[PDB]
Write a protein that binds this ligand. Sequence first.
Ligand SMILES: [Cl-]
Length: 86
Amino acid sequence: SASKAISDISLEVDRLGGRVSAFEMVTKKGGKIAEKDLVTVIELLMNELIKLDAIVAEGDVKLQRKMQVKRVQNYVETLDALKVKN
Ligand SMILES: [Cl-]
């Protein structure tokens, strides 16, 4: 069930996105993020990217898969930018 299996990865991406948001706030408020934590989250996101680089769908479901892929790419992009700065 494509649509379902993606909405599932989507739930994990929601949670990982929350961690990204937490890292951003810490940084915004003058705090420091452990490099170890940045790598942990980036790598959990890459695992979701791998899971989504294998879900076959058609029609609007294919669009949902690409949207989740875009979400992950954006978060990794945000995390890479933070790592430079942490
Ligand atoms: Cl697809």
